[PDB]
Amino acid sequence: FVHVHHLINEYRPHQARETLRVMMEVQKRQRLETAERFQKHLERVIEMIQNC
Amino acid sequence: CEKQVQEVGLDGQPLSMSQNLARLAQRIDFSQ
Amino acid sequence: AKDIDVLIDSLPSEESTAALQAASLYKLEEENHEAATCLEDVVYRGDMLLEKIQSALADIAQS
Amino acid sequence: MKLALNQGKVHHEMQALEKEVEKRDSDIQQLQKQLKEAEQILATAVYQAK
């Protein structure tokens, strides 16, 4: 029981830090993808505007 | 950082039209 | 016993003490702050583009 | 003669108005898509800001 508690206490902080880093990376990737999509949409809008 | 509470908020999400409708109903209720 | 030993050996060898986990969290927070600054710049650019498009639409409708 | 000239001018103005209406519809659709994208991005940013 003592060894199990020690292993749980040792594995909790590293797992939490890894999850936080993965969440930050996912948020950064989603923000970059949204920015690229908005840029492409604005380009298509300018193209459609200059079309007429 | 440390935003897992909102990052794992999978029912526990674009601009909801119902929220805008409720806000308009609260705003267009009277021209105070 | 073999499974317990292999799991304890291949477990996360890191923040059992108090320095490696703190350093990893600090590095992750710095990376998240940089990514948040980049995302804020991108979102400001996108909001400016959307505001310009909305102003153009309002001007077209005003005609 | 004035009625013929007015009919020609009305046809030209109707063509111009149809072109302007098509351009306005395209711009409105594009701005609506961009606004939905920006709203989703703002929601994600407010969620990740904590």
The Cα C27–Cα C32 span in angstroms is 9
Cβ of A31 within 8 Å of Cβ of D23? The answer is: no
Distance, in angstroms, between A20 CA and closest chain B CA?
6
Distance, in angstroms, between B10 CA and closest chain D CA?
12
Q: Which of B2, B9, B15 is facing D47, going by the closest CB pair?
A: B9
Q: Which residue in D has a C-alpha nearest to residue C62's C-alpha?
A: D24
In angstroms, what CA-CA distances link C59 with A10, A11, C54, C55, D50?
62, 59, 9, 6, 37
**Spatial CB neighbours of A40, under 8 Å, sequence gap ≥ 6:** none
Q: Which residue in D has a C-alpha nearest to residue C41's C-alpha?
A: D45
CA A24 to chain centre: 5
The Cα A19–Cα D47 span in angstroms is 16
Q: Which amino acid is at C54?
A: Q
Cα dihedral C29, C34, C39, C41 in deg (nearest 10): 140
Q: Which residue in B has a C-alpha nearest to residue D35's C-alpha?
A: B15
Cβ of A45 within 8 Å of Cβ of D22? The answer is: no
Which of C13, C37, C42 is the best residue to mutate to test the A interface, defined by the most A CB atoms within 10 Å of its own CB?
A: C42
The Cα C12–Cα D23 span in angstroms is 59
Cβ of C14 within 8 Å of Cβ of A14? The answer is: yes
- A19 contacts in C (CB within 8 Å)? none
In angstroms, what CA-CA distances link D19 with C5, C50, C55, D23, D37?
76, 23, 20, 6, 27
Distance, in angstroms, between D50 CA and closest chain A CA?
12
Contact D48, C36 (CB under 8 A): yes
Q: Which amino acid is at D35?
A: L
- Given 3-state DSSP classes, what are the helix, strand and coil percentages for chain D, each rounded to the nearest 5? 95, 0, 5
**Positive/negative CA dihedral, C56, C60, C63, D6:** positive
Distance, in angstroms, between C15 CA and closest chain A CA?
6
Cβ of B3 within 8 Å of Cβ of A27? The answer is: yes
- Give the resolution in Å: 4.0
